[PDB]
Write a protein that binds this ligand. Structure first.
Ligand SMILES: *[C@@H]1O[C@H](CO)[C@@H](O[C@@H]2O[C@H](CO)[C@@H](O)[C@H](O)[C@H]2NC(C)=O)[C@H](O)[C@H]1NC(C)=O
Lengths: 50, 49, 49, 49
């Protein structure tokens, strides 16, 4: 299974099995026994507008 | 969200993707390239059928 | 950074010295290149025969 | 792009430059401009940029 989305830069730490924040609990909560992987990168050049 | 090009770090969007796997709940069908060889016989060998 | 060349040509009849007259020099070419030029040479067309 | 200790310089002239394409693009993280306000840059004429 592949789950994709876009978040803010400061909130990347919230995505961590065994953590509770605002995105972590109200938007997307991953079970702590996570048998997988997580990838993230910057997209300011693609998802920004004057 | 508010996303301006001039915004400092942490206020700029990041793209995130997570991959979730299973642990032997069905006949596995998703894995990398294995270069299959020929089939020897009548010898003590280990196999990966 | 500008190389300016002004030129003029005149038919003459005096034997040796420079003419004792007056003549303006019209502009010829301007070049937008900047160099640290400090010396220069001359070309001659010798008869290879 | 060249290194900072060997920064690269180009001389641009004899052209028609439109700054709106540079002005509106959001790819540039940092913009800061000194001699003339940016909105007026499309209104002047220069040489040897
Ligand atoms: C232009 O060339 C001259 C000579 O090639 C340079 O003058 C030299 O400058 C160095 C550095 O101060 C001195 O050590 C030499 O003795 C100078 N030589 C002479 C003959 O004066 C000059 O610096 C160059 N100018 C630029 C802007 O590159």
């Amino acid at each position: 299974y592949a789950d994709s989305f876009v978040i803010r830069g400061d909130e990347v730490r919230q995505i961590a099995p065994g953590q509770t924040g605002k995105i972590a609990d109200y938007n997307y909560k991953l079970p702590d026994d996570f048998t997988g992987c997580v990838i993230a990168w910057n997209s300011n050049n693609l998802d920004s507008k004057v | 969200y508010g996303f301006q090009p001039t915004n400092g770090v942490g206020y700029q969007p990041y793209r995130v993707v997570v991959l979730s796997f299973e642990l032997l709940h069905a006949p596995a069908t998703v894995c990398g390239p294995k270069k299959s060889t020929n089939l020897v016989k009548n010898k003590c060998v280990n196999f990966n059928f | 950074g500008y190389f300016k060349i002004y030129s003029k040509h005149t038919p003459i009849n005096l034997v040796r010295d420079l003419p004792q007259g007056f003549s303006a020099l019209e502009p010829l070419v301007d070049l937008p290149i900047g160099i640290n030029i400090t010396r220069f040479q001359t070309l001659l067309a010798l008869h290879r025969s | 792009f060249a290194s900072v200790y060997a920064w690269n310089r180009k001389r641009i002239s004899n052209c028609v430059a439109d700054y709106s394409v540079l002005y509106n693009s959001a790819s540039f993280s940092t913009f800061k401009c000194y001699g003339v306000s940016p909105t007026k840059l499309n209104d002047l004429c220069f040489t040897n940029v």
